[PDB]
Design a binder for this molecule. Structure first.
Ligand SMILES: Nc1nc2c(ncn2[C@@H]2O[C@H](COP(=O)(O)OP(=O)(O)OP(=O)(O)O)[C@@H](O)[C@H]2O)c(=O)[nH]1
Lengths: 98, 272, 73, 84, 74, 847, 77
RNA sequence: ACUCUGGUUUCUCUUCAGAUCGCAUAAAUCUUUCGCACUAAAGAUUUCCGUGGAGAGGAACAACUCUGAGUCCAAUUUUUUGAGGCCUUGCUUUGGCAAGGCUA
């Protein structure tokens, strides 16, 4: 690393200008976020905080999973939980329907 | 109570320089080869005298150099004489050169010579190739300079700001080779009468050229040195009972702090 | 990391990523989470015990560990 | 504070007979030749057992440390200076 | 602090490499780096189909390196 | 296993399980010149593997000088084995079998008895003194026995704390010592793979007194441990030689940046060490805590109060740590028993390496046939029973197992010297305390009980009912010859058997002691010098026989030779008077007796190579050069026997029926000699006309052998006989002022100075001189007394030279108790040795 | 001794048709012209084409940036 | 890097001390030896000059130096993923487990 300075605030710059700034929109505006999990599961909730590792905490998260019989989507409700960043495939903010 | 001293090295060096007129200025104990306590022990036990040493009296009456007959063993016609077998040869190897050796304290063998080059100028480096030191006559799978080994940025020899020698490095090395107590830096006090200041003077070799009275005095001092060392008995175990404390405990005695001369006159008159 | 020091020498059962079960005396662990278990036995499922001995299991292969027995004498 | 007790136990294990289990389900047992800071071991005279159970002999190898799942150290090492 | 892997004994020696996806390789080693990535000359594919395909100079990432086997005597 | 023992860093079960892995074992011998620091190498090592065993502040516990005479005499007198588990630089542990050998030139037989069972050597070389007499002699002996040589330049504080050399001149001194060692090694060895250099890890730097020991790699690892980012193995390759650090580019070049730039060793290794020592000894009160802070060493306040020498030892102990440079050096450059078992069998097994047992032993396989070889015999303190000590080269020796001890004369057809015995106990021997074990596999050293009866010096211990064709290991070949000679007799002759038993026991103790009973009923001991025989007599009187023993004056063994060819060809007939032999005797060519003794030539060679040698080397015709029959009183003795009988004059085939008897007669008559019953040296015997009786019932047996002996005697006597003196080689180290006193002391003892020369980097001088062995008793005492202790000499046997006079001359008148002039030393030496042997008063010169 | 980085730089200078193996994707192979590399093994192929093993359908991907964490083995031709 | 022991000096008393108890070295008595006992040796006992260890009490100021103890790492090699999905057989604890073949 070419920036070993102790006053490391570049992590927030990526949270404002980098790809991680998308999660900052959900943290600030409190928008619903849908994330695809590596276990072929989808969770919709509201992320409160995260880090460079992408590990975020969601509140009022609804988890969807398909089980086969034929693939049927099962739904479970969770008040709040902490999800590892490395255990996610893709994270996207809820599209604006209007 | 004055029972232990802790000193710094610039004090020990100064005390060492002042005492030098009383000091031997040897660096070894090779000087005392066949002239040490064990050698004199052996010479006493073998009933012989090292030239220059004490002369005791026969330890035990036994066979004599004129008391053994001719045998076929010790026949003097089978003996080749190249150099006379001195008595020092019978002290040095007490079991090869001697029939019936008893009480032979084996003498200490060599000690590697100390090559401590004593310093002369305080205005020279402490580490300096002295002219007393025989020159080293000048005259490798190393890797190439182009090899990519780089010493990292924050790496330097271990003590690098520390100077090699200080203004008391020459003096503090000379203190390693000092005679005790100057090769100490702490210790326990002695009584003034327990310190002989000339006991290492007469343990030296009997000086050549001095009149016979001086040399006999040297050997006679050595005789009592050896007898003290040999007849030494361990101090017996006891219970500490101090007389003058018992004197002060009673009501008959008291205490003050007088000049020495006043008490000298008091003791003189009292004894009279 | 005293959370694992108190478990040192205890006969513990470890669940691996591949599903294997290792029961043995936990000797030491590292920052990488490498497991050093002595007198270890391998448990797999059909139940069967495969005694191994001193086991040096990599930290990545470590999934979950629980104490199974107190340290022996 | 740099090398863990398992690292010392593994390093001191060279010379005896060691059995290594790889992520590919292959078990190699042989006399360790040298071990590095990582799990990278270069065994010798390895009797290699495949997943199906085929047994093969490998004279020289260099086991990649990342792929090493679990290994069985020699029973002598149980009294090692580091493991005491 | 990545010490280079101890692979000097296998340098310029015929070695067989194991691929992550159950693959096998063959070739003569030419160099390595702290990441274990190896450059092999006269590389032979040795695919599971049974037909050996020669490539030559190839580069293999250390992540996919499963196991090294020294075919030549070291 | 179940024995009470001092607490160790390791645990005895780890030691017991390391013995079964012969790649983790290192059988090492420690050797060097006298007082060059070997004892505390192991002692400082025993400290680090024995936390409670701590050296006394003011006195070093040598822990390997376990005996009595060693303890007050302060010399090493016997070798003492030490077994320690020692960690490496990388933390790995190896089982070190270390043999601590003495460094006196007299006690070299202990060194050879330790070199036999070792796979490598660590030569100790005082950094101030340098390369001395025994350093060169042990280098020669250790490259001859085919051992892997490493070097520890010990006592490097003397460069700092005594000589006070600038760090660069200390570097020059160390480089000069290494170069001297390399030159000696290349002198005594053809192949070049014994190159010694600290860049190869071959040379270690040490100061045992102050707990310093490093190689280049371990010091570089100190750096790497502190500043974590350097690769200490490539750092170590830039820390010696003319390679300089360029601090601007952070790279090491072969050329010095600008000028006044220091080499890498000085800059990175020697200056830090100078500064540690200087800070401790000079500035301990002022600025030692700051530098101990820099190095990361924290001494408790009760320790900064220590005297300067314990403080230096403790500081250097903290900074350096354990002696892992030593272990690195020995693990890398000294073979394991498994790898070094092939040279061992190739060299020291009489059966040759190609034999089947010379194959099962060269694997060092601990499940094969038992083959244990003992070279030392250590006496229990009661002095009654001994314990053999050797290494197990194969199989595994168990306690209680019955074994078959083979002597030194055992052969595969003469099987009477072997004897069945019963191993009682087996001890793994650390220096002082024995750790009793139950078995000892191949590749290890064991102290055996129960086999002490049928062995005198060495043994081969095998299994009975198997191993039907197990030969012996060759008996130790020593550095020197035992020349000094004393005779002993009990004071009260009623107790002669006690003294005879004591003589047997000392013969067991000392590897090269040679006690013999001369013809006159006189018991003689042969030794190497005065310290050696002094200690032998000490042991004899005080340990093995508790009686009073008289000692004769010391004398030497002589030898007999010739100085021309016999005037009239001599002859001798058998009592049958049908067999007639005729010989003449002439002196061997210059420099041939050494070739015959030093196995440069053997009679095992085919006639072609033997003749070719003699031809190209000493101008011999093919006829005579291939005509050699035998070689000296031994198989390698310094005498030849040549048959000049012409094939026309005498039937060569018929003559061949008495070759095997003429050879024996010549061997025996050279073993005895006619003058004073001493060996004959440097004499060539040519046969001239051997008229042989055809009748086999008339020749052969007890008829022809004495005739051969008598003709040998007469032929020797017609060529002018002479005597021979053993000449000693004296090396003296004395200051420059006391050099002339050495000349004064020498000249009174027929001594002749070859050279005097300074010691580089040292204020002292080395005087080398030759002195007759007989003119040497008390010479050490004379030199150390005349110089007030400042001159010291170790003397060793060099060659055989002729006594000045003529032994056969009755015109010489000798008085009984006075030294002779040189013109007739030979006559006295001849007649007094005759009188002492018990023979007649004078020879009978005749035919 | 040839280093992997030096070999990659030489291949990029030559711009040969480098075929890169995939980590855990044996069937899917990708060939292309190497343009540049990085310390993370990230490679950019000018004319990329994915080659399968069962389908063997060469689908052109154009200028693509393959992550170093997925590459298996780089081969020429 | 936060908190808690332990101090040092001095006076007196009790016990053990064969440890150079003392880096010094006295005197007495008894025995033996020889001379013929200051001008001499050996052995033993004692007393004196005066020490170490432990323990105990008193009284003077330092109290946390030290001794200890309790109190910055997401891009190969370990902890910021090649993960998840399909097929057959034995047993289904009808949840699926085990092995193999696969797709990604
Ligand atoms: N200056 C200095 N003296 C040392 C050093 N090491 C040992 N000595 C001393 O030098 C002498 C050597 O004695 P030892 O080490 O026992 O001798 P040795 O090397 O075993 O040799 P031998 O007497 O033949 O047994 C002793 O006085 C040691 O204390 C050292 O590093 N420096």
């Amino acid at each position: 690393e070419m920036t070993p300075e102790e006053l490391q605030k570049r992590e927030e710059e990526e949270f404002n200008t980098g790809p991680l700034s998308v999660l900052t929109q959900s943290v600030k505006n409190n928008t619903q976020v849908l994330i695809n999990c590596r276990n072929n599961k989808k969770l919709l909730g509201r992320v409160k905080a995260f880090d460079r590792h992408c590990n975020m905490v969601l509140e009022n998260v609804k988890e969807m999973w398909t089980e086969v019989s034929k693939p049927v989507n099962k739904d479970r409700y969770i008040s709040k939980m902490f999800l590892r960043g490395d255990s996610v495939i893709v994270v996207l903010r809820n599209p604006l329907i209007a | 109570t004055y029972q232990r001293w802790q000193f710094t090295l610039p004090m020990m060096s100064t005390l060492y320089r002042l005492a030098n007129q009383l000091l031997t200025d040897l660096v070894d104990d090779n000087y005392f080869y066949l002239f040490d306590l064990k050698a004199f022990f052996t010479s006493k036990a073998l009933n012989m005298a090292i030239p220059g040493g004490p002369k005791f009296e026969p330890l035990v009456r036994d066979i004599n150099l004129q008391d053994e007959d001719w045998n076929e063993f010790n026949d003097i016609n089978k003996i080749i004489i190249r150099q006379p077998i001195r008595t020092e040869y019978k002290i040095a190897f007490p079991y090869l050169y001697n029939n019936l050796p008893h009480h032979v304290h084996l003498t200490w063998y060599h000690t590697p010579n100390v090559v401590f080059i004593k310093t002369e100028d305080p205005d020279l480096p402490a580490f300096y190739f002295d002219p007393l030191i025989n020159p080293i006559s000048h005259r490798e799978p190393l890797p190439d300079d182009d090899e990519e080994f780089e010493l990292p940025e924050f790496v330097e020899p271990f003590l690098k700001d520390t100077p090699l020698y200080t203004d008391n490095t020459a003096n503090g090395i000379a203190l390693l080779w000092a005679p005790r107590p100057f090769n100490l830096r702490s210790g326990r006090t002695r009584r003034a009468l327990d310190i002989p200041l000339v006991k290492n003077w007469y343990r030296e070799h009997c000086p050549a050229g001095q009149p016979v009275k001086v040399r006999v005095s040297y050997q006679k001092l050595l005789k009592y040195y050896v007898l003290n060392a040999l007849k030494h008995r361990p101090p017996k175990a006891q219970k500490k009972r101090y007389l003058f404390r018992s004197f002060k405990a009673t009501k008959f005695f008291q205490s003050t702090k007088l000049d020495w001369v006043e008490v000298g006159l008091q003791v003189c008159r009292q004894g009279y | 990391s005293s959370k694992m020091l108190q478990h040192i020498d205890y006969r513990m059962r470890c669940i691996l990523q591949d599903g294997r079960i290792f029961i043995g005396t936990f000797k030491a662990f590292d920052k990488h989470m490498n497991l050093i278990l002595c007198d270890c036995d391998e448990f797999r499922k059909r139940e069967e015990k495969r005694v191994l001995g001193l086991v040096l299991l990599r930290g990545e292969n470590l999934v979950s560990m629980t104490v199974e027995g107190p340290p022996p004498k | 504070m740099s090398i863990g007790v398992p690292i010392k136990v593994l390093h001191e294990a060279e010379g005896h007979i060691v059995t290594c289990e790889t992520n590919t389900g292959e078990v190699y047992r042989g006399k360790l030749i040298e071990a590095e800071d990582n799990m990278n071991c270069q065994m010798s005279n390895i009797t290699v057992t495949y997943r199906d159970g085929r047994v093969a002999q490998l004279e020289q190898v260099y086991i990649r440390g990342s792929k090493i799942r679990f290994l069985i150290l020699p029973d002598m090492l149980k009294n090692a200076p580091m493991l005491k | 602090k990545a010490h280079p892997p101890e692979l000097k004994k296998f340098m310029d020696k015929k070695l067989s490499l194991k691929l992550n996806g159950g693959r096998h390789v063959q070739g003569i080693l030419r160099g390595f780096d702290p990441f274990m990535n190896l450059v092999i000359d006269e590389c032979v594919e040795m695919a599971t189909s049974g037909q050996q395909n020669n490539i030559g100079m190839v580069v293999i990432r250390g992540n996919s390196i499963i196991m090294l086997e020294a075919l030549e005597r070291v | 296993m179940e024995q009470t023992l001092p607490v160790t860093v390791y645990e005895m079960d780890f030691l017991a399980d390391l013995m079964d892995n012969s790649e983790l074992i290192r059988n090492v011998t420690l050797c060097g010149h006298l007082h060059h620091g070997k004892t505390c190498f192991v002692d400082c090592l025993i400290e680090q593997t024995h936390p409670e065993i701590r050296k006394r502040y003011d006195q070093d516990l040598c822990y390997t000088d376990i005996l009595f005479t060693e303890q007050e005499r302060g010399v090493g007198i016997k070798s003492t084995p030490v077994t320690v588990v020692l960690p490496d630089t990388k933390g790995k542990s190896y089982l070190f079998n270390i043999m601590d050998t003495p460094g006196h030139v007299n006690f070299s037989d202990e060194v050879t008895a330790g070199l036999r069972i070792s796979d490598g050597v660590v030569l100790f070389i005082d950094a101030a003194e340098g390369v001395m007499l025994n350093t060169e002699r042990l280098i020669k002996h250790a490259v001859q026995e085919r051992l892997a040589v490493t070097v520890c330049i010990n006592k490097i504080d003397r460069l700092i704390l005594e000589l006070k050399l600038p760090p660069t001149d200390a570097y020059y001194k160390l480089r000069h010592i290494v170069d001297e060692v390399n030159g000696l090694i290349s002198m005594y060895s053809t192949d070049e793979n014994l190159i010694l250099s600290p860049l190869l890890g071959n040379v270690c730097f040490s100061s045992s007194q102050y707990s310093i020991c490093f190689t280049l790699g371990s010091f570089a690892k100190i750096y790497a441990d502190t500043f974590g980012d350097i690769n200490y193995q490539e750092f170590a390759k830039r820390l010696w030689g003319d390679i300089y650090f360029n601090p601007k580019t952070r790279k090491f070049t072969k050329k010095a940046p600008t000028s006044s730039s220091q080499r890498s060793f000085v800059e990175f290794i020697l200056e830090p060490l100078y500064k540690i020592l200087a800070q401790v000894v000079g500035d301990v009160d002022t600025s030692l805590p700051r530098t101990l802070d820099e190095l990361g060493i924290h001494l408790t306040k009760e320790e900064l109060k220590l005297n300067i020498r314990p403080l230096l030892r403790l500081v250097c102990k903290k900074f350096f740590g354990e002696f892992t440079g030593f272990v690195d050096m020995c693990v890398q450059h000294i073979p394991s028993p498994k790898v070094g078992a092939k040279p061992k069998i190739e060299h020291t097994y009489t059966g040759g390496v190609d034999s089947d047992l010379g194959e099962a032993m060269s694997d060092c396989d601990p499940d094969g046939p038992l083959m244990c070889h003992t070279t030392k015999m250590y006496s229990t303190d009661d002095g009654v029973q001994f314990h053999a000590f050797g290494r197990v080269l194969s199989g595994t020796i168990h306690a209680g197992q019955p074994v078959k001890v083979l002597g030194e004369n055992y052969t595969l057809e003469d099987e009477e010297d072997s004897q069945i015995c019963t191993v009682g106990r087996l001890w793994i021997s650390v220096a002082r305390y024995h750790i009793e074990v139950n078995r000892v596999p191949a590749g290890n050293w064991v102290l055996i009980e129960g086999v002490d009866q049928p062995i005198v010096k060495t043994a081969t211990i095998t299994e009975p009912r198997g191993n039907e064709e197990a030969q012996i290991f060759r008996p130790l070949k020593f550095n020197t010859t035992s020349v000094i000679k004393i005779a002993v007799e009990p004071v009260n002759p009623s107790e002669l058997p006690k003294m005879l038993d004591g003589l047997r026991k000392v013969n067991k103790s000392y590897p090269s002691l040679t006690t013999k009973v001369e013809e006159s009923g006189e018991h003689v001991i042969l030794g190497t010098g005065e310290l050696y025989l002094d200690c032998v007599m000490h042991d004899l009187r005080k340990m093995y026989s508790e009686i009073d023993i008289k000692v004769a004056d010391p004398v030497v063994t002589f030898c007999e030779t010739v100085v021309e060819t016999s005037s009239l060809k001599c002859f001798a007939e058998t009592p049958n008077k049908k067999n007639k032999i005729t010989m003449i005797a002439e002196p061997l060519e210059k420099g041939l007796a050494e070739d015959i003794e030093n196995e440069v030539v053997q009679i095992t060679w085919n006639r072609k190579k033997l003749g070719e040698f003699f031809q190209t080397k000493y101008d011999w015709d093919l006829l005579a050069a291939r005509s050699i029959w035998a070689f000296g009183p031994d198989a390698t003795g310094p005498n030849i026997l040549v048959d000049d009988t012409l094939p026309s004059e005498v039937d060569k085939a018929l003559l061949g029926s008495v070759k095997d008897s003429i050879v024996q007669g010549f061997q025996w008559g050279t073993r005895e000699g006619p003058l004073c019953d001493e060996l004959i040296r440097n004499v060539k015997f040519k046969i001239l006309d051997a008229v042989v009786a055809q009748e086999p019932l008339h020749r052969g047996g007890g008829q022809i052998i004495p005739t051969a002996r008598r003709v040998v005697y007469s032929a020797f006597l017609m060529a002018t006989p002479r005597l021979m003196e053993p000449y000693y080689f004296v090396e003296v180290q004395a200051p420059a002022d006391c050099v002339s006193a050495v000349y004064t002391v020498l000249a009174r003892r027929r001594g002749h100075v070859t050279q005097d020369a300074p010691i580089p980097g040292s204020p002292l001088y080395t005087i080398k001189a030759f002195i007759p062995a007989i003119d040497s008793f008390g010479f050490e005492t004379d030199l150390r007394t005349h110089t007030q202790g400042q001159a010291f000499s170790l003397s060793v046997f060099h060659h055989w030279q002729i006594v000045p006079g003529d032994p056969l001359d009755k015109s010489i008148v000798i008085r009984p108790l006075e030294p002779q002039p040189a013109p007739h030393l030979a006559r006295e030496f001849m007649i007094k040795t005759r009188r002492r042997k018990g023979l007649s008063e004078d020879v009978s010169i005749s035919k | 001794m040839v280093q992997p980085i030096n070999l990659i730089f030489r291949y990029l200078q030559n711009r040969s048709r480098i075929q890169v193996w995939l980590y855990e994707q044996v069937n899917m192979r990708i060939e292309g012209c190497i343009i540049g590399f990085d310390e993370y093994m990230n490679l950019v192929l000018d004319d990329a084409e994915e080659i399968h093993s069962k389908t063997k359908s060469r689908k052109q991907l154009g200028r693509i940036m393959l992550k170093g964490d997925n590459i298996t083995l780089l081969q020429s031709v």
